[PDB]
Design a protein around this nucleic acid. Sequence first.
DNA 1: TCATGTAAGCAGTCCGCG
DNA 2: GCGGACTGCTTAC
Length: 903
Amino acid sequence: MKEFYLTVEQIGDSIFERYIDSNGRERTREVEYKPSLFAHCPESQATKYFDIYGKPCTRKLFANMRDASQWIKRMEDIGLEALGMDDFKLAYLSDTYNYEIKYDHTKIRVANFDIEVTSPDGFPEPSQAKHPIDAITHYDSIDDRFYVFDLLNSPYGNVEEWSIEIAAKLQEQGGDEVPSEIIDKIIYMPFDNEKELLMEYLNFWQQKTPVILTGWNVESFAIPYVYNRIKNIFGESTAKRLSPHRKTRVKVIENMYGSREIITLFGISVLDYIDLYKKFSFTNQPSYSLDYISEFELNVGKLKYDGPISKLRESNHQRYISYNIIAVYRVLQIDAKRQFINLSLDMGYYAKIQIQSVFSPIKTWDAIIFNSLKEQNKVIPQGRSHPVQPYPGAFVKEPIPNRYKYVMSFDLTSLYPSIIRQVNISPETIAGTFKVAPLHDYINAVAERPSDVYSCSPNGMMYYKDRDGVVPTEITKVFNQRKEHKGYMLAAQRNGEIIKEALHNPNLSVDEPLDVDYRFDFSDEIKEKIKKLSAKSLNEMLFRAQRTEVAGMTAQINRKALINGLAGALGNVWFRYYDLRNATAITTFGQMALQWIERKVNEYLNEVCGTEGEAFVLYGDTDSIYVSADKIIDKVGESKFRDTNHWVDFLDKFARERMEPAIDRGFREMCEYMNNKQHLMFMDREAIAGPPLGSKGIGGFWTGKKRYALNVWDMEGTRYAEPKLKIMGLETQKSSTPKAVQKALKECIRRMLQEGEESLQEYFKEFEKEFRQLNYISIASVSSANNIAKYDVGGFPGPKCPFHIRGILTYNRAIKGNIDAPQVVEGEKVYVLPLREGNPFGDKCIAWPSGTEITDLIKDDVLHWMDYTVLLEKTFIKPLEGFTSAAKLDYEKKASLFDMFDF
DNA sequence: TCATGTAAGCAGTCCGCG
DNA sequence: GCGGACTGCTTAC
Ligand SMILES: Cc1cn([C@H]2C[C@H](O)[C@@H](COP(=O)(O)OP(=O)(O)OP(=O)(O)O)O2)c(=O)[nH]c1=O
Ligand SMILES: [Ca+2]
Ligand SMILES: [Ca+2]
Ligand SMILES: [Ca+2]
Ligand SMILES: [Ca+2]
Ligand SMILES: [Ca+2]
Ligand SMILES: [Ca+2]
């Protein structure tokens, strides 16, 4: 088998590499790497090396990496460019693996762990680590085993061994419901004292050294806690045994409320699952506790225990250990669904970077582009410093706020990367400039053609049409992978709807789910078999279809994110290929493309409908247009339709057969106008939206830019079993809106769009009447809490203190002297509740850590003093007033002359 | 919230306002 | 008690 790296580090003049050899064995080697850099030389001098602009360079081969670094400093002082890859471990990986890496994940040791630490005096700070580690569960992907280290004797209590038999039992029978499928995989190890637990854990770590180290919050808690605890007991040299190269870097973030550390373990790639999740999931959660995220992702219940966690080990050691094990497993279950570790490995090896560098699109692209250029014997430019400079982005149309009955939307495929490819935008493809007209003149095709020789953007830039740019070339590769995976995702999505339709008429039989690949549209024969399946089998199939969809979603959306990352990297000062001419060539072209096609669509629909000057395009943002389809429906006549699906079919065909070809002709003209290298402006139909036929539903509405709601019947070719709300920007979409209010507002919207005003009024009246009965957490607002210190003047609010920060200060004063009260953490999210006048907290609101119950000592007072009137007004009524005034509807029946009668 | 980019909405503070 | 200038936060793309 072909070899592949696991980890790489630079330590002085040495590269330390862990890798898999040709026999599939894990090996480590220290290499005195001899790096090369480059300097421009005279044209007369023969060389195989050229910079990206075709200028000759000489290779400087250095005896060591320090020599190479010192040369860079001297060149800077002389004032000459020092070219080539200055991150030597990237150069090393490129030299060592000069081929497309095929990796075997079964050889890569992926470790997932979490620790428990009983603390009778508040949160156990990793930087201090003054309390015993009393449990560790460490799952090893190669052994497929959960290694459980259990401390039986501690200054905070001596306890009996944990029971696997009791652990497996149902919670309703006094057990802990440790899942049956991992019971056989647990290796339990009790210890009579902390020192032997920790020594054994280190010995174990040596035998089974993680390559990828993950878990929930491991970077900020478990790793620095373990490191500092070992350091305190045994000394730092023993702590450094956590690094296969015995090298660590400790970085301390000082703060007004307490300092914390992050530990770099040389020779390990730490991918904290919370960071993976935040980067790759495309959610914004109100809380990032594992309980909340597990509930969100897996629909499993909160891990219930009585009393504080500081007393759980002593009162119920049995459950304490089971919960530690289950928490480790939950992360594994989320990853089985989401597949972020797989993605990280895919991306890391593709780029030839340290796996942890997947978090940085700038590092990722620098490596991809370096490897690409190196193949052609080309030499990369030196990284330069630039001042931060704002620059223009996309265009967003101002919509007329209103209800909109029938809407069809259209969207450009992968816009920014497509612009890069179409225009041929790269550092080395720049051909010159042309004198710009106002953008409006290009949009309306009155400006003179920019060039009949080069490929142009309306920002004034011209590019070579005949040479391949490294940026377009490498962006195309990832785009094509993105396209493949999005195909698999949409197929699984369509397949899911086939199963949902078949669930309306399940069969009374004992059968099994069909063995099929959900990444491909079901054949006619499979669809026939599905129509005869039982509910049990259909439900299992739907689960499998949805899991396939989620895997496709992970794969496509993050490759989309990577290529989009390159377009913005051009406008980031730390990017080697930073250049506002290119960043701006992209965004400006986008602005033109959107407004050009709005004109073309308005022109086309007026023509086919036999009118002039009517505005069909009602809205657009960046690369999308929203087309009012009312006149289309009216041209044929509503009564001509049998049911909802008939008019949806009609509009789907109208868009594909009439509109899309006109859209294509429009963009082909624009491509000729700009003399671009390749036509890649592909704008396909996205949503078909409207009210159910024969209903009083309004179909959709806009309140403003980035704020709208649509009742969607078909999305990108997925014909839904049941209509689906597409809501953008409104409070239902914001993580700061209370959970129960999101729900109530969404149903208000559903009623407006599908049923009409009277239905809305009925629901509003009910919610208003019942809302005081909702659980306090469900009606609490949420906010991130940044710069808490700045506004903290002797426990009271300073000037311009934000509302949520005021709530934290109110909380801090309320929990003073209470050692068991959870502290609010800087930068994390809080629940927020307004308080009534005269409350014992002495202020207008309170805030506490999100995803938790407020501490029992002040909970009673919070419930008593909650200002429901204010909560309803601010979070529910005011947003709803926004939706309904825009929609020209009322949520309350208003007074009229009819009130004089007894109805 | 350690990690490409800009556009742009709403909540809230402070200030003005016979 | 509402509007403008300002920060903070969050979402759409
Ligand atoms: C969603 C998103 C878009 N953008 C930019 C780049 C996109 O090309 C542009 C349009 O956004 P989108 O239309 O959402 O995405 P896309 O055109 O790149 O991909 P597709 O429509 O095929 O799914 O806005 C970002 O920079 N960051 C983002 O998170
Ligand atoms: Ca725990
Ligand atoms: Ca798009
Ligand atoms: Ca059936
Ligand atoms: Ca879009
Ligand atoms: Ca599309
Ligand atoms: Ca109390």
